[PDB]
Amino acid sequence: KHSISDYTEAEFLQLVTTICNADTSSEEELVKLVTHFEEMTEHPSGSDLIFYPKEGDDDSPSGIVNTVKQWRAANGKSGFKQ
Amino acid sequence: ESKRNKPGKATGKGKPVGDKWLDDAGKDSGAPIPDRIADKLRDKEFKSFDDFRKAVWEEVSKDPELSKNLNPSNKSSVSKGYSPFTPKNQQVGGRKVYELHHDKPISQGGEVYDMDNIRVTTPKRHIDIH
Numbered sequence: 001k002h003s004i005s006d007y008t009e010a011e012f013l014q015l016v017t018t019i020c021n022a023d024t025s026s027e028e029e030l031v032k033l034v035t036h037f038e039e040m041t042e043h044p045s046g047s048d049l050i051f052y053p054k055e056g057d058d059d060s061p062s063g064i065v066n067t068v069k070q071w072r073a074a075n076g077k078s079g080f081k082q
Numbered sequence: 083e084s085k086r087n088k089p090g091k092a093t094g095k096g097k098p099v100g101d102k103w104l105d106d107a108g109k110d111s112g113a114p115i116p117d118r119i120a121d122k123l124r125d126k127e128f129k130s131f132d133d134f135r136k137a138v139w140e141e142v143s144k145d146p147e148l149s150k151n152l153n154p155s156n157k158s159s160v161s162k163g164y165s166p167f168t169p170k171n172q173q174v175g176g177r178k179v180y181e182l183h184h185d186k187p188i189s190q191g192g193e194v195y196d197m198d199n200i201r202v203t204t205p206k207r208h209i210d211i212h
C-alpha cells in the first residue's frame with residue numbers, strides 16, 4: 001500500500017470505513033491510518049475529508065471515497081486499481 | 083518517571099460551554115472542561131491522567147450537547163474514549179487530536195485531576211502555550 005493506485009476502490013473503502021468507525025485497538029493505530037489516508041489521497045483537506053466535511057459533502061465512508069475519487073480524477077492524479 | 087501516572091480523584095467545577103466549545107480549544111489557554119462533564123467525573127478515582135482523559139471523551143460521547151458538534155467519524159472516536167481529531171490546520175505533524183492541558187503545570191505543583199486546572203487544546207495551540 002504505497003500509493004492509492006495500489007488500492008482497488010473496494011479496498012480503499014475498507015480503509016476509510018475502518019477510520020470512520022474508529023475500528024482500531026488504540027488511538028495510535030487510528031492516527032497512523034489517518035496519516036496513511038492523507039498520504040494516499042494527496043487531497044489538500046487532509047483528515048478534514050473524514051472529520052470536517054465541507055457543507056453538503058457526504059461524510060459516510062462511501063461519500064468520502066467518492067469525493068477522493070472525483071478529486072483525483074479532476075486534478076490529474078492516477079486512480080484506483082482496475 | 084512521571085506524576086501524571088499516580089492515581090487520584092477528580093475535583094473541580096468546570097465552566098458552561100456552548101457549540102463553539104472545541105473552537106475555543108485553539109485559542110488562549112484552551113477551552114475549559116464543561117461543567118456538565120465535571121459533574122459526571124467529580125469524585126471518581128483515576129489510576130492515571132490518561133485514564134482521566136479516556137473518561138472525559140467517553141462523557142463527551144454520552145452528552146448530546148457536546149457530541150452533537152462532532153461528525154459521525156469523530157463520534158466513533160470519542161465513543162471509544164479516543165480524543166477527537168482537530169481540523170487539519172490545528173494539527174502539528176503526528177499530533178492530530180485534542181490534547182488536555184494543565185493551566186498551572188504539574189511540573190510546577192499544578193493539580194493533576196482538578197478540572198478547573200484542565201483545558202482542552204489543539205496541538206498547535208498546546209505547543210504554542212508551552
Ligand SMILES: [Zn+2]
Pocket residue numbers: 182183184208211212
Ligand atoms: Zn500543557
